[PDB]
Amino acid sequence: QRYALVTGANKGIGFEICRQLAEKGIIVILTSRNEKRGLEARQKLLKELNVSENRLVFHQLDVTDLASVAAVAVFIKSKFGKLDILVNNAGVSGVEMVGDVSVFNEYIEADFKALQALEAGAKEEPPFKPKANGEMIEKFEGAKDCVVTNYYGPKRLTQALIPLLQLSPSPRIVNVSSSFGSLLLLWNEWAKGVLGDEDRLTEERVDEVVEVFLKDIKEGKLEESQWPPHFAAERVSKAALNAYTKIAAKKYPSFRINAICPGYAKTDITFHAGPLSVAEAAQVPVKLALLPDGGPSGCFFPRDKALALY
Ligand SMILES: NC(=O)c1ccc[n+]([C@@H]2O[C@H](COP(=O)([O-])OP(=O)(O)OC[C@H]3O[C@@H](n4cnc5c(N)ncnc54)[C@H](OP(=O)(O)O)[C@@H]3O)[C@@H](O)[C@H]2O)c1
Ligand SMILES: C=C(C)[C@H]1CCC(C)=CC1=O
Numbered sequence: 537q538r539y540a541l542v543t544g545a546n547k548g549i550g551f552e553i554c555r556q557l558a559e560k561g562i563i564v565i566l567t568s569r570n571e572k573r574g575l576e577a578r579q580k581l582l583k584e585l586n587v588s589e590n591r592l593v594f595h596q597l598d599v600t601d602l603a604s605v606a607a608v609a610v611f612i613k614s615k616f617g618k619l620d621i622l623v624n625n626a627g628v629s630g631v632e633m634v635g636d637v638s639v640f641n642e643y644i645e646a647d648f649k650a651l652q653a654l655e656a657g658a659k660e661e662p663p664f665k666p667k668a669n670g671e672m673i674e675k676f677e678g679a680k681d682c683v684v685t686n687y688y689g690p691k692r693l694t695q696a697l698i699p700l701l702q703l704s705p706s707p708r709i710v711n712v713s714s715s716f717g718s719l720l721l722l723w724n725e726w727a728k729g730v731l732g733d734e735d736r737l738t739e740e741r742v743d744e745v746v747e748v749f750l751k752d753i754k755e756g757k758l759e760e761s762q763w764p765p766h767f768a769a770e771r772v773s774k775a776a777l778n779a780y781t782k783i784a785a786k787k788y789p790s791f792r793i794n795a796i797c798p799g800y801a802k803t804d805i806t807f808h809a810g811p812l813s814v815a816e817a818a819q820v821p822v823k824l825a826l827l828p829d830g831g832p833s834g835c836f837f838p839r840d841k842a843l844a845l846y
């Protein structure tokens with residue numbers, strides 16, 4: 537059999553990744569940080585799939601808790617003896633909303649427009665302030681949770697699961713990242729140079745980038761230290777995740793390890809805005825989880841490029 541573990545799978549894109557992999561006949565370990573939510577998600581998905589009980593298994597996993605990470609590896613080893621697919625899907629935004637929550641989507645739309653302009657050769661991100669009566673608050677505690685969940689989480693879980701993934705004939709890791717991890721949006725020239733210097737990339741260099749960011753937001757130096765004007769922790773964490781994807785792909789050459797953007801999809805993180813359904817979003821990480829042997833590794837794929845790979 538093939539076995540897949542999906543993090544952050546009690547709702548959103550992660551839940552649909554579990555659906556789509558299970559439909560392909562892969563035995564899915566649906567994981568969640570909250571045990572009650574995860575057990576209820578498993579019950580719902582099993583009902584909707586209408587498949588036998590052994591097709592979908594639950595285990596608790598909080599990607600920010602080292603004991604939880606270690607325990608899931610012990611569980612997989614005892615129950616299955618290998619792992620074929622790891623999908624690092626869990627993530628948080630680092631932002632708290634005050635007032636009209638649709639301001640979150642105004643920033644997303646502005647950032648997509650900015651990225652398109654930058655990719656077309658423009659040299660700076662336009663300033664942006666929202667229309668509606670809300671604001672996105674970005675504080676240290678949320679930024680730390682964002683970095684620890686979105687960057688340290690995939691790194692630590694990847695590292696814990698290497699022995700089991702090495703026992704697969706086609707080991708696959710898919711990191712659910714974002715187009716907003718583009719270095720074009722990162723602002724900080726030092727960090728852009730470090731994360732972009734692929735030949736010198738190491739885990740220690742990426743850790744240093746994220747820790748310098750966290751010290752700056754702790755001290756209120758984000759503008760003076762040239763970090764992004766908004767979605768700072770999200771951008772930093774996803775850029776770091778993309779860099780770690782490259783590091784890990786080089787370190788584990790028999791694996792295929794890739795980062796993706798699912799597209800802008802209706803989930804709790806977006807207040808259920810965005811053009812894509814959750815099922816549409818999940819197609820992207822599923823595509824990379826099922827990548828044939830010999831395919832790309834170490835890369836970041838936006839939605840349309842991912843879906844065109846094969
Ligand atoms: N939706 C989009 O437009 C979009 C676009 C680009 C990238 N993404 C990425 O897609 C991924 C999935 O997010 P989503 O859109 O599906 O949002 P979501 O509905 O908010 O789901 C996030 C999931 O991550 C889980 N999670 C958060 N912190 C965790 C932790 N410490 N340990 C384990 N699980 C944790 C959440 O669990 P709880 O229920 O316990 O909170 C939930 O299951 C994220 O990495 C996000 O950055 C989304
Ligand atoms: C918090 C964010 C802005 C995430 C999730 C939503 C989208 C569209 C992209 C991201 O980077």
